[PDB]
Design a protein around this ligand. Structure first.
Ligand SMILES: C[S@@+](CC[C@H](N)C(=O)[O-])C[C@H]1O[C@@H](n2cnc3c(N)ncnc32)[C@H](O)[C@@H]1O
Lengths: 125, 218
């Protein structure tokens, strides 16, 4: 099958940065979610970086800068994935650091394992 | 109806599937799009048809053997003249062209593929089965099928195109209209297997292996 590298090259030659992964394989992640609602890898960096200085609960402040479009209310929602907690109501309104996030996860991702309350890779409350 | 605990219960339930899907996506979950489709999101108004030319010619000594389209006619409203101007002459050197023509534009399309220098020779007919007949309001007759006009140019006398291999009649349902039957690509295979394909104005549900799909909804 040479159609693989032909498909591999032509995707690299013309496809948008989102539709095609840096290796050249189709990145399904964009195709799995409807419309242009896929959160770019750059956008995730933008949310991580916007969130620490601005802080949680600043979504009214949060929307205005990093995500050029009006982001979905999800910014609260996505953040939970970074913090590995189904209910961020404990962490809300606390400005955090860009490095602090991951430490929060490993504890909760560990706690949810000894609490048997781990589902989908995120601490469920 | 006592539903504070109802509406709060669906939220944390719906958030789990997000948490579920957003994990599987990171677990190498496969979308339905095959791994050989060449999807390009663009607007044919602003695309560079020399970037698609220079590339394909390089990553394949050939051009496109079969060209599909289902253009959107104003009746996402693309003007009649701006579709006529798409440089289809240079995308295709030797093969067929498949273009779907609604009845309001059935004559328009025949004019369209002739200015591009082709030669009308056939027409696929896609009748709609109820699951076995369609009801469509036409000004003169009830519409129960859509037509896909077939033009051709160049030397098809090569073994690249299996003659006398597909019919003109198709019997699929009205799946996700406006969506075209998948049986077309199978016919294009029987006509011309393992070849360079192109489908202008396509969507997610049109992606196939070896198909270069252009459409501002991908
Ligand atoms: C009538 S549909 C064709 C759908 C196709 N029959 C299929 O397989 O489903 C029109 C589609 O053309 C694409 N499109 C519309 N306007 C476009 C434009 N101006 N430039 C490029 N693509 C366009 C959009 O996806 C729109 O969904």
């Amino acid at each position: 099958i040479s159609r693989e590298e032909y498909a591999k090259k032509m995707r690299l030659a013309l496809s948008d940065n989102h539709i095609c992964k840096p290796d050249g394989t189709v990145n399904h992640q964009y195709f799995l979610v409807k419309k242009g609602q896929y959160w770019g890898e750059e956008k995730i960096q933008y949310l991580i970086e916007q969130l620490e200085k601005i802080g949680v609960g600043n979504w009214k402040q949060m929307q205005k800068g990093l995500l050029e479009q009006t982001s979905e209310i999800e910014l609260e929602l996505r953040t939970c994935l970074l913090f590995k907690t189904t209910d961020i109501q404990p962490y809300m309104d606390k400005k955090f650091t860009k490095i602090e996030i991951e430490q929060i996860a490993q504890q909760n991702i560990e706690k949810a394992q000894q609490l048997s309350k781990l589902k989908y890779g995120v601490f469920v409350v | 109806q006592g539903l504070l605990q109802d509406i709060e219960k669906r939220i944390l339930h719906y958030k789990q599937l997000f948490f579920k899907e957003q994990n599987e996506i990171a677990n190498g979950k496969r979308s339905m799009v095959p791994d050989n489709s060449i999807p390009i999101c663009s607007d044919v108004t602003k695309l560079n048809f020399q970037a698609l030319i220079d590339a394909q010619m390089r990553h394949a000594g050939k051009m496109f053997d079969v060209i599909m389209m289902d253009p959107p006619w104003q009746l996402d409203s693309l003007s009649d003249e701006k579709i006529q101007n798409m440089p289809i002459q240079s995308l295709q050197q030797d093969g067929f062209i498949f273009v779907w023509a609604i009845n309001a534009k059935y004559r328009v399309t025949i004019k369209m593929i002739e200015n591009w220098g082709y030669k009308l020779v056939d027409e696929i007919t896609w009748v709609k089965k109820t699951v076995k007949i369609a009801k469509g309001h036409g000004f003169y007759l009830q519409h129960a099928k859509e037509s896909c006009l077939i033009g051709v140019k160049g030397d098809v006398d090569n073994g690249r195109f299996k003659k006398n291999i597909a019919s003109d009649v198709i019997f699929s349902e009205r799946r996700g209209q406006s969506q075209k039957p998948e049986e077309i690509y199978q016919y294009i295979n029987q006509l011309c297997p393992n070849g360079n394909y192109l489908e202008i104005f396509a969507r997610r549900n049109n992606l196939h292996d070896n198909w270069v799909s252009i459409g501002n909804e991908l």
